[PDB]
Amino acid sequence: MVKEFNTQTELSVRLEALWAVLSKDFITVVPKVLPHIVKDVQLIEGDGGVGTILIFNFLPEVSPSYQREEITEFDESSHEIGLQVIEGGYLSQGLSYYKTTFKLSEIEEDKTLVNVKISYDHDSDIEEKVTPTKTSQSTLMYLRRLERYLSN
Ligand SMILES: C=C1C[C@]23C[C@@]1(O)CC[C@H]2[C@@]12C=C[C@H](O)[C@@](C)(C(=O)O1)[C@H]2[C@@H]3C(=O)O
């Protein structure tokens, strides 16, 4: 069964600037903020609303070298986006289901709360173990990098 792991971070960024990047501009911004991981991102189907499929190609060092992602939720009223791995990425590392959902809310004019929900399940017959503690840490690192990018 799918479990949910919640964490959060607060970033010194403006809510709508962060929402733009997390929900839309991540196509150009992701390789710029994670240049040691991500080579490029391409929209394969859809234009950025729900149902949109994207491929992330990682640097050739990296393994797995790609993930195919689907936008499964896009709520601009509540600033919530859900992004599901449908192939590759953690699904090549022992996880049977993986989704990341970001919900933003204002703390101040230039401070924003990011609630991060990781939805996941494992297949126990695969020996490699990857915990949502570990995967959440990667997501937070990405957020902190995004913070630095928006604040220069
Ligand atoms: C360091 C990370 C964090 C990634 C996976 C990665 O290994 C590299 C790509 C990051 C990411 C970038 C944008 C999206 O917010 C995310 C859910 C995704 O699909 O890809 C993000 C995704 C995630 O947060 O799990």
Side-chain angles (χ1 to χ4, degrees):
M1 299 290 290
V2 174
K3 270 73 62 165
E4 294 178 339
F5 178 102
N6 298 282
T7 192
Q8 61 297 297
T9 188
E10 40 295 336
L11 298 187
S12 286
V13 297
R14 295 168 173 86
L15 161 75
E16 291 294 354
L18 187 61
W19 176 246
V21 317
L22 284 175
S23 77
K24 187 183 319 297
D25 282 328
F26 62 90
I27 313 324
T28 56
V29 177
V30 168
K32 288 176 195 304
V33 312
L34 293 180
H36 59 313
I37 301 167
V38 182
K39 188 171 172 51
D40 49 64
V41 188
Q42 178 62 48
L43 296 202
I44 301 305
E45 177 156 21
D47 293 320
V50 174
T52 295
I53 313 293
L54 306 89
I55 293 283
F56 290 76
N57 280 287
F58 307 135
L59 286 181
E61 358 293 303
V62 177
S63 179
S65 77
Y66 75 98
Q67 66 195 55
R68 179 187 311 266
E69 200 78 8
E70 186 175 346
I71 298 181
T72 61
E73 176 194 2
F74 192 99
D75 191 333
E76 39 195 50
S77 194
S78 69
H79 299 106
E80 192 167 74
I81 182 166
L83 308 152
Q84 174 167 16
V85 182
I86 58 167
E87 193 191 357
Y90 296 131
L91 293 188
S92 299
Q93 304 191 244
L95 293 202
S96 54
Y97 184 99
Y98 197 90
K99 179 190 294 169
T100 308
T101 298
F102 298 111
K103 157 76 174 259
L104 305 186
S105 60
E106 181 174 1
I107 300 167
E108 290 203 51
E109 193 273 319
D110 192 28
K111 304 195 209 70
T112 298
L113 171 58
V114 186
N115 283 292
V116 177
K117 176 174 64 162
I118 289 162
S119 319
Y120 72 99
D121 199 4
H122 287 99
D123 179 316
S124 71
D125 298 313
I126 290 170
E127 285 165 5
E128 183 179 2
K129 196 214 317 295
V130 166
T131 63
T133 298
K134 172 87 190 289
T135 69
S136 74
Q137 281 165 359
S138 286
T139 303
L140 294 170
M141 176 282 291
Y142 162 56
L143 293 166
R144 199 107 265 155
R145 283 184 166 248
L146 218 37
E147 187 186 36
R148 279 181 287 252
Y149 174 73
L150 273 37
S151 285
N152 57 41

